[PDB]
Amino acid sequence: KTAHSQGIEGKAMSEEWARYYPRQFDSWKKTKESDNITDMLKEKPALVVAWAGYPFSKDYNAPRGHYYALQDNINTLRTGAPVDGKTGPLPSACWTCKSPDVPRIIEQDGELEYFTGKWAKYGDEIVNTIGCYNCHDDKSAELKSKVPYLDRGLSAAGFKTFAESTHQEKRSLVCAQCHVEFYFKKTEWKDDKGVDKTAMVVTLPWSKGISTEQMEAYYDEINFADWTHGISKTPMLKAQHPDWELYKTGIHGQKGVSCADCHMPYTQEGAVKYSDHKVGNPLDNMDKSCMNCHRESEQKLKDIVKQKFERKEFLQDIAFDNIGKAHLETGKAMELGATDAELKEIRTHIRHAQWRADMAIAGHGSFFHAPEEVLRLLASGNEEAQKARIKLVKVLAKYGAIDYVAPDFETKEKAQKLAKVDMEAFIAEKLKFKQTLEQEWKKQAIAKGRLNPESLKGVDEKSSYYDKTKK
Amino acid sequence: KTAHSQGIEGKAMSEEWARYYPRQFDSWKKTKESDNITDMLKEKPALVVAWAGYPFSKDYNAPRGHYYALQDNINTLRTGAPVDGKTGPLPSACWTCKSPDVPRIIEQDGELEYFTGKWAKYGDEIVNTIGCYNCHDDKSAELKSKVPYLDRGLSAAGFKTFAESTHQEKRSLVCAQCHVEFYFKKTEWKDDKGVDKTAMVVTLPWSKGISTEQMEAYYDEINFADWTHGISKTPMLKAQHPDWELYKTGIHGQKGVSCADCHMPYTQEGAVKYSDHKVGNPLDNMDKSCMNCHRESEQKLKDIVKQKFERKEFLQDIAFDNIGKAHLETGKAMELGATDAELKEIRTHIRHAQWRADMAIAGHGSFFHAPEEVLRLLASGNEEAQKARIKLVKVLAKYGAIDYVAPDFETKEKAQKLAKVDMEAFIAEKLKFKQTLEQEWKKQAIAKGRLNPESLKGVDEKSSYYDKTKK
Ligand code: HEM
Numbered sequence: 001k002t003a004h005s006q007g008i009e010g011k012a013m014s015e016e017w018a019r020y021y022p023r024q025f026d027s028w029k030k031t032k033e034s035d036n037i038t039d040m041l042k043e044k045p046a047l048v049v050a051w052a053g054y055p056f057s058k059d060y061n062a063p064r065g066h067y068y069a070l071q072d073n074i075n076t077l078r079t080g081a082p083v084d085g086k087t088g089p090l091p092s093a094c095w096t097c098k099s100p101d102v103p104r105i106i107e108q109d110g111e112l113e114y115f116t117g118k119w120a121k122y123g124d125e126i127v128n129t130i131g132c133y134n135c136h137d138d139k140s141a142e143l144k145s146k147v148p149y150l151d152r153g154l155s156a157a158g159f160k161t162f163a164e165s166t167h168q169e170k171r172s173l174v175c176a177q178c179h180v181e182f183y184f185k186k187t188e189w190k191d192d193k194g195v196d197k198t199a200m201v202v203t204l205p206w207s208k209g210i211s212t213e214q215m216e217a218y219y220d221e222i223n224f225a226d227w228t229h230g231i232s233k234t235p236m237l238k239a240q241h242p243d244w245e246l247y248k249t250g251i252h253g254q255k256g257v258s259c260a261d262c263h264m265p266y267t268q269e270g271a272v273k274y275s276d277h278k279v280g281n282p283l284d285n286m287d288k289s290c291m292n293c294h295r296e297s298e299q300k301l302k303d304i305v306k307q308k309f310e311r312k313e314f315l316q317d318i319a320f321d322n323i324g325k326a327h328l329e330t331g332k333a334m335e336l337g338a339t340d341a342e343l344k345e346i347r348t349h350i351r352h353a354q355w356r357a358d359m360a361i362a363g364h365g366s367f368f369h370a371p372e373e374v375l376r377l378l379a380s381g382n383e384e385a386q387k388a389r390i391k392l393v394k395v396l397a398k399y400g401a402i403d404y405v406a407p408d409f410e411t412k413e414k415a416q417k418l419a420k421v422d423m424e425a426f427i428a429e430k431l432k433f434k435q436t437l438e439q440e441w442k443k444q445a446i447a448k449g450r451l452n453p454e455s456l457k458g459v460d461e462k463s464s465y466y467d468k469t470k471k
Numbered sequence: 472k473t474a475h476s477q478g479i480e481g482k483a484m485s486e487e488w489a490r491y492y493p494r495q496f497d498s499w500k501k502t503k504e505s506d507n508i509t510d511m512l513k514e515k516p517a518l519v520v521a522w523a524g525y526p527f528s529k530d531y532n533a534p535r536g537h538y539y540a541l542q543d544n545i546n547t548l549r550t551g552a553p554v555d556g557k558t559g560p561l562p563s564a565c566w567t568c569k570s571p572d573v574p575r576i577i578e579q580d581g582e583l584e585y586f587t588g589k590w591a592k593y594g595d596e597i598v599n600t601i602g603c604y605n606c607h608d609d610k611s612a613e614l615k616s617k618v619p620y621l622d623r624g625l626s627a628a629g630f631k632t633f634a635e636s637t638h639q640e641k642r643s644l645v646c647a648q649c650h651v652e653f654y655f656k657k658t659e660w661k662d663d664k665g666v667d668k669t670a671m672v673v674t675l676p677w678s679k680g681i682s683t684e685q686m687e688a689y690y691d692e693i694n695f696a697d698w699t700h701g702i703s704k705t706p707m708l709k710a711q712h713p714d715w716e717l718y719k720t721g722i723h724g725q726k727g728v729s730c731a732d733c734h735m736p737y738t739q740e741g742a743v744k745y746s747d748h749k750v751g752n753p754l755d756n757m758d759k760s761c762m763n764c765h766r767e768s769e770q771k772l773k774d775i776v777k778q779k780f781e782r783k784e785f786l787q788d789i790a791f792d793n794i795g796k797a798h799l800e801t802g803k804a805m806e807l808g809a810t811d812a813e814l815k816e817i818r819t820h821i822r823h824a825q826w827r828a829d830m831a832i833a834g835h836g837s838f839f840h841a842p843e844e845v846l847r848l849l850a851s852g853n854e855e856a857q858k859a860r861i862k863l864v865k866v867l868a869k870y871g872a873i874d875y876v877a878p879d880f881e882t883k884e885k886a887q888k889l890a891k892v893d894m895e896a897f898i899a900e901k902l903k904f905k906q907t908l909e910q911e912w913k914k915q916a917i918a919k920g921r922l923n924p925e926s927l928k929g930v931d932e933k934s935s936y937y938d939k940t941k942k
C-alpha cells in the first residue's frame with residue numbers, strides 16, 4: 001500500500017503527485033523537451049487535397065511531447081475561435097485525450113454530460129495536460145484506464161477488459177486510452193432534470209475487429225461519414241492515429257512487447273526499478289529501449305528503421321498522389337454535369353482508398369510498429385484510387401474532357417487554394433480568441449486553483465502559425 | 472588435409488564422394504523426398520498472360536528437390552523436343568545450374584565453347600544432377616564457386632569475389648552460383664582453329680548493383696529484351712529466382728545469417744559437426760533451422776510466416792491482374808490500329824510493371840527472405856501497370872472502344888488460349904523426344920561411364936503433364 005492510500009487532494013494536477021513520486025514526476029515533466037512543430041500539411045500537401053472540406057485541411061502537425069497536448073489542442077486551427085462556451089466549430093469530445101481533468105469531469109458530471117456541448121464549454125476546467133491521473137489510481141497507484149470507451153471497444157472486439165488483462169497488456173492499454181482510431185457517435189439522452197440532450201460520444205469502431213478492413217466494414221454498415229469531401233463530395237472516413245490497433249498485429253505486438261517496453265524503459269538501481277516517464281522517440285535512448293533484446297550496434301538498428309521509413313514514404317507519396325488526382329477528377333466531372341449515380345462507384349473506391357491509406361499513415365510510428373501491414377495498406381489504398389481513376393477517365397470522356405489534367409498540389413499554398421481554405425482569415429480569428437477568451441480561461445482556472453501557472457512555462461511558444469522562438 | 476588430397480577420379484559423379492563423406496552423401500540424396508510437382512501456371516494463370524510469347528507460358532512449376540534438377544530441365548516443355556544435337560528451342564546455357572557435369576565440361580572445353588550451341592549439344596554428357604562437385608573442391612573439400620559468371624557479377628557490383636569473401640559469405644555464395652537472376656549475352660568469339668562462333672553466355676545484370684531498380688536501369692541502358700510480348704508486343708524482361716539478390720537486403724541477410732544457416736543447419740555429435748545436406752523447406756525442421764536464434768513455439772513462428780505469404784499473395788494477385796489486363800488492352804488497341812508511337816509510353820510502363828512484379832515473386836522464398844521489399848516491389852509494379860491502364864483507356868477511346876472489357880484469364884486453359892499456346896501439340900512432341908532421343912542420351916552416358924543408373928531411381932515419375940504416381 002502507498003503513502004496516499006486514502007487518495008490525493010487535487011489529484012488531476014500532476015504536481016500533487018510529486019511529493020510521493022519525485023523521480024517519475026521529474027521524467028514525466030521532461031517531455032517539455034520535445035517541442036518541435038512539424039507542419040504535416042507543409043511536408044505532405046497532398047494531405048490538404050485529401051482532407052478538403054474537413055478541419056485537418058487547415059492545420060495538422062506531427063505529435064510532440066505530452067507536455068504540449070492541452071496547449072496544442074487549444075492552438076490548433078481545427079478548434080477555431082469560440083467567443084464563449086456555446087460557440088466554436090468542435091464539440092467537448094476534443095478534450096478527451098488531452099488532460100487528467102477529463103476523468104475528473106466525467107467522474108463529477110457523468111460521461112453523457114461531459115460529451116454534451118461545445119469544446120469551449122470546458123475551457124476553464126480542462127486545463128492540465130496529460131498527467132499521472134490519466135494512467136494511475138490515486139489510492140493504489142496501479143495502472144488504470146480512466147475512460148469508459150476503451151473497455152467498451154475492447155469488449156466489442158472480443159478482447160479482455162482492462163481489469164481482466166495481464167500486467168503486460170495493461171502496459172500498452174493505458175496508452176490505448178488515447179492512441180487509437182475513434183469517431184463521434186451522436187447520442188440522444190435525457191438528464192436528471194428530464195431535459196433532452198445530444199451527446200457526441202467518443203467511440204472505437206472495433207465491433208467487427210481491429211483490422212483496417214473490419215473497421216471499414218463497420219463504418220460502411222452504419223453508412224457513416226466523418227465529412228462530405230469538399231472537392232469530390234465523397235462520403236469520407238478520417239483515420240486518427242490507430243497506434244495500438246496497428247501495433248497489435250506487428251511482430252513486436254504479437255511477441256507481447258508492450259508500448260512501455262520501448263517508450264518507457266526501465267532503469268535498475270539496486271533493488272529499485274524505475275520507468276522512464278519521458279515518453280518520446282525510443283531511437284533517442286536505444287541502449288535502454290532496444291538493446292536488452294537486440295544484439296548489434298545502434299547505428300545498424302537505426303539504419304534498418306530508416307529503410308522502413310523510406311519504403312513507407314515511397315508508397316505513401318504514390319497513394320496520396322492518386323487519391324488527390326481522383327478527388328480533383330471527380331470535382332471536374334461534377335462541374336461538367338456528371339450525376340451522383342454516374343459517380344457512385346467512383347466515390348466508393350475513393351472512400352476506401354483514402355480510409356486504407358490514412359489508416360496506414362495516421363499512426364506515425366506504424367511504419368515501424370507494423371511495417372508489413374503498413375506497406376500492404378498503402379498498396380491496397382492506391383489500388384482502390386487507381387480503380388476510381390480508370391472509371392473517371394470514362395466519365396470525363398462522356399462529358400468531353402478525356403484529356404483533362406488534374407491541377408498540381410505540390411505546395412501547401414497551392415493545395416489549400418484547391419481546397420478553398422482561407423488560412424489568413426482562420427489565423428486572424430484564432431489569434432483574437434487566444435488573446436481574449438483563452439487568457440480568460442487560464443486566469444479563471446488559476447483563480448479557482450484548477451491550474452498551476454508553473455505548468456505553463458514555455459508551453460505556448462510555438463504553433464504551425466507562430467514561433468516566438470523556443471518552447 | 473583430406474583422404475582425397477590428389478583429387479577424385481569421376482569427381483562429377485557425386486557417388487564417387489560417398490567413400491569419404493557417407494553422412495553428407497546420405498542427406499544430399501534425401502532431396503529425392505521433395506518430389507511434388509506444383510504447376511504454377513495452373514495455380515496462377517495470370518502468369519500465362521504475363522509470359523505470352525515466351526516458353527514460361529508453356530510450362531512453369533514450383534521448385535522441388537535438387538535430386539530432380541537435371542530431369543526437370545529435360546522434362547520441362549520449355550526445352551522442347553530436339554531431334555539431334557543441333558535442334559530444339561533453347562541453348563546450351565540451360566544446363567548451367569542443373570549439374571556438376573557443367574564445371575567438368577567448362578574445365579575441359581572452355582567457357583565460350585560450353586556456351587556455344589543448342590541445349591541438345593550436351594544431352595549425353597550433362598547427366599548428373601546438382602552434386603558435391605558444384606560446391607566443393609575435389610582435393611581440399613573447401614567451398615568453391617565453380618562458375619566464372621558469379622565472380623564476374625560480384626565484381627561488377629563492387630562485392631568481394633568468392634575467394635576474397637568470408638567463410639560465412641561463402642556459405643551463401645555457393646547457392647548464388649544458381650539462385651540469382653540472369654540473362655544470356657550474345658557473345659561473338661573465335662576458337663583455336665580460328666572458326667567464328669556465337670556463344671549465349673550466362674550473365675548476372677549486376678553492374679549497377681543488385682536492387683530490382685538498378686537491374687531495371689541496367690537492362691534499359693543496353694535496350695535488352697528477353698522477348699517481344701505475344702499479345703502487347705512490349706519489349707519484356709523475365710525475372711528468374713533472384714533468391715540471393717533479394718535475400719541480401721532482407722533483415723536476415725543484413726544480420727549475416729547465411730542461406731546455409733536455415734537451409735543446411737548443423738547437428739553436433741560430440742566433437743564433430745555435420746551440415747544437413749537435405750536442402751528443402753526450413754519450416755520442416757524448425758528446431759534446427761530457426762530455434763537456435765528464436766525463442767518461442769514452432770506453431771507461432773510458422774503462423775507469422777504464413778501471414779507474410781498471405782500479404783504477398785494479396786498484392787501478387789492485384790499486380791498480375793492489372794498487368795494481364797494491360798497486355799490484353801494493348802493487344803486490343805493494336806487490333807484497332809493504334810501505332811507503335813501511340814503505345815510507346817504504355818509499353819514502357821508494362822515492361823517496368825512486370826519486371827518489378829516478376830522480380831518480387833520469381834524467388835519463391837523472397838516473401839520470407841525480404842518480406843518488406845517484396846511488398847514494395849509488388850506495389851511499385853502494380854502502380855506502373857495502372858499508369859499504363861489509365862493511358863490505355865484514352866488510346867482505346869481514340870479508336871472507338873472505350874468500353875472494351877479485357878477477356879478473363881482465371882484458368883490455365885483460358886489463359887493459354889489467349890496466349891495461343893497449343894499445349895497438346897507441345898506435349899505430344901515432347902513425349903516422342905523423351906521416348907527416343909532422351910533414352911539414347913541416357914543409354915550412351917551409362918555406356919560411357921558418365922552416368923550411374925542408380926541415380927535415376929524414381930527421377931522420372933512426374934512432370935506437369937504426367938504422373939506415373941510417385942517419385
Ligand atoms: C505509455 C503510453 C503512451 C505512449 C507510449 C505514448 C506515445 C506517444 C508518443 C511517442 C508521442 C510523441 C512524443 C514526442 O513527439 O515527443 C505522444 C504524443 C501524444 N500523446 Fe501519447 N502515449 C501514451 C499515452 C498517452 C495517453 C494516455 C494519452 C491521452 C490522455 C496520450 C495522448 C497523446 C497526445 C494528445 C500527443 C500529442 C501531444 C502534442 O502534440 O501536443 N498519450 N504519445
Ligand code: HEM
Pocket residue numbers: 059060061062063064072073076078079090093094095096097177178179180182202241362363364
Ligand atoms: C476532434 C477533436 C480533437 C481535436 C481538435 C484534437 C486535437 C489534436 C491536436 C491539435 C493534436 C496534435 C497534432 C496535430 O496537430 O494534429 C492531437 C494529437 C493527438 N490526439 Fe487529438 N484531438 C481531438 C480528439 C482526440 C481524441 C478523442 C483522442 C483519443 C481517443 C485523441 C488523441 C490524440 C493522440 C493520441 C495524438 C498524438 C498522435 C498523433 O497525432 O498522431 N484526439 N490532437
Ligand code: HEM
Pocket residue numbers: 014017018021024025026028029130131132133134135136141143167170171174175260264273274275276277
Ligand atoms: C508525474 C505523473 C506520474 C507519476 C507520479 C507516476 C508514477 C508512477 C509510479 C510510482 C510507477 C511505478 C514505478 C516505476 O515503474 O517507475 C509508474 C510506472 C508506470 N507508469 Fe506512471 N506516473 C505518472 C505518469 C504516467 C502516465 C501519464 C502514464 C500513461 C501514459 C503512466 C504509465 C505508467 C506505466 C506504463 C508504468 C510502468 C508500470 C509497470 O511496468 O508495471 N504514468 N508510474
Ligand code: HEM
Pocket residue numbers: 251252255257261262282283289290291292293294301302304305368371722765766
Ligand atoms: C525501439 C527499439 C527496438 C528496435 C529499433 C527494434 C528493432 C527490431 C526489428 C528491426 C525487428 C525485425 C522485425 C521487423 O521487420 O520490424 C524486431 C523484431 C523483434 N524484436 Fe525488436 N526492436 C526494438 C525493441 C525490442 C524490445 C524492447 C524487445 C523485447 C521486449 C524486442 C524483441 C523483439 C522480438 C521478439 C522480435 C521478433 C523477431 C525475433 O524473434 O527476433 N524488440 N525488432
Ligand code: HEM
Pocket residue numbers: 062063064172175176179243244245247252253257258259260261262263281282283305363364365366368369
Ligand atoms: C500501442 C503501443 C505503442 C504506442 C501507443 C506507441 C506510440 C508511438 C507513437 C505515437 C509514435 C510516433 C512518434 C512521433 O511521430 O513523434 C511512435 C513511434 C515509434 N515507436 Fe512506438 N508505440 C507503441 C509501441 C512501440 C513498441 C512496442 C516499440 C518497440 C518495439 C516502439 C518503438 C517506436 C519506434 C522505434 C518509433 C519511431 C521513432 C522514429 O522513427 O523517429 N513503439 N510510437
Ligand code: HEM
Pocket residue numbers: 505533534535536537538539540541543544567568569570601605606645646647648649650730731734735750751752
Ligand atoms: C546451399 C545452397 C543452396 C540453397 C540454400 C538452395 C535452395 C534450394 C531450395 C530450398 C530448393 C527447393 C527445394 C525443394 O522444393 O525441396 C532448391 C531447388 C533448386 N535449386 Fe537450389 N539451393 C542451393 C544450391 C544450388 C545450386 C549450387 C544450384 C545449381 C547448381 C541450385 C539449383 C537449383 C535448381 C535447378 C532447383 C530446382 C530443382 C527442381 O525443381 O528440379 N541450387 N534450391
Ligand code: HEM
Pocket residue numbers: 530531532533534535543544547549550561564565566567568648649650651653673712833834835
Ligand atoms: C533457359 C534455360 C533454362 C531452362 C530451360 C531451365 C529449366 C528449369 C526448370 C524446368 C526448373 C524447375 C522449375 C520450373 O518448372 O521452372 C528450373 C528451376 C531453377 N533453375 Fe533453371 N533453367 C534454365 C536456366 C537456368 C540458369 C542459367 C540458372 C542459374 C544461373 C538456373 C537456375 C535455376 C534455379 C536456381 C531453379 C530453382 C528456383 C526456382 O525455380 O524458382 N536456371 N530451371
Ligand code: HEM
Pocket residue numbers: 485488489492495496497499500601602603604605606607612614638641642645646731735744745746747748
Ligand atoms: C554428396 C555430395 C556432397 C558431399 C560429399 C559434401 C561434403 C561436405 C563436407 C565434408 C562438409 C563439411 C562437414 C559438414 O559441415 O557437414 C560439407 C559442408 C557444406 N557443404 Fe557439402 N557436400 C556435398 C554437396 C554439397 C552441395 C551440392 C552444396 C551446395 C549447394 C554444398 C554446400 C555445403 C555447405 C554450404 C557446407 C557447410 C560449410 C560450413 O559450414 O563451413 N555441399 N559438405
Ligand code: HEM
Pocket residue numbers: 251294295722723726728732733753754760761762763764765772773775776839842
Ligand atoms: C527458417 C527459420 C527462421 C524463421 C522462421 C525466422 C523468423 C524470423 C522473423 C519472422 C523475423 C522478423 C523479421 C521479419 O519481419 O521477417 C526474424 C528476424 C531475425 N532473425 Fe530469424 N528466423 C529464422 C532463422 C534465423 C536464424 C537461423 C538466425 C540466426 C543465425 C536468426 C536470427 C534473426 C535475427 C538476428 C533477426 C533480426 C531481428 C532481431 O534482431 O531479432 N533467424 N526471423
Ligand code: HEM
Pocket residue numbers: 533534535643646647650714715716718723724728729730731732733734752753754776834835836837839840
Ligand atoms: C541466398 C540465400 C538463400 C537461398 C538461395 C534460399 C533459397 C530458398 C528457395 C529457393 C526457397 C523457395 C523454396 C520453394 O519454393 O520450394 C526458399 C524458401 C524459404 N527459405 Fe530460403 N534461401 C536463402 C536464405 C534463407 C535464410 C537465411 C533463411 C532463414 C532466415 C531461409 C528460410 C527460408 C524459409 C522459411 C522459406 C519458406 C518455406 C515455406 O514458405 O514453405 N532462407 N529459400
Ligand SMILES: O=N[O-]
Pocket residue numbers: 240241
Ligand atoms: O486530433 N486528435 O486525434
Ligand SMILES: O=N[O-]
Pocket residue numbers: 711712
Ligand atoms: O528456368 N531456370 O531459371
Ligand SMILES: [Ca+2]
Pocket residue numbers: 181182183237238239240
Ligand atoms: Ca476516425
Ligand SMILES: [Ca+2]
Pocket residue numbers: 652653654708709710711
Ligand atoms: Ca532474367
Ligand SMILES: [Y+2]
Pocket residue numbers: 009010016
Ligand atoms: Y498535496
Ligand SMILES: [Y+2]
Pocket residue numbers: 062063064
Ligand atoms: Y514527433
Ligand SMILES: [Y+2]
Pocket residue numbers: 251371372842843
Ligand atoms: Y517485418
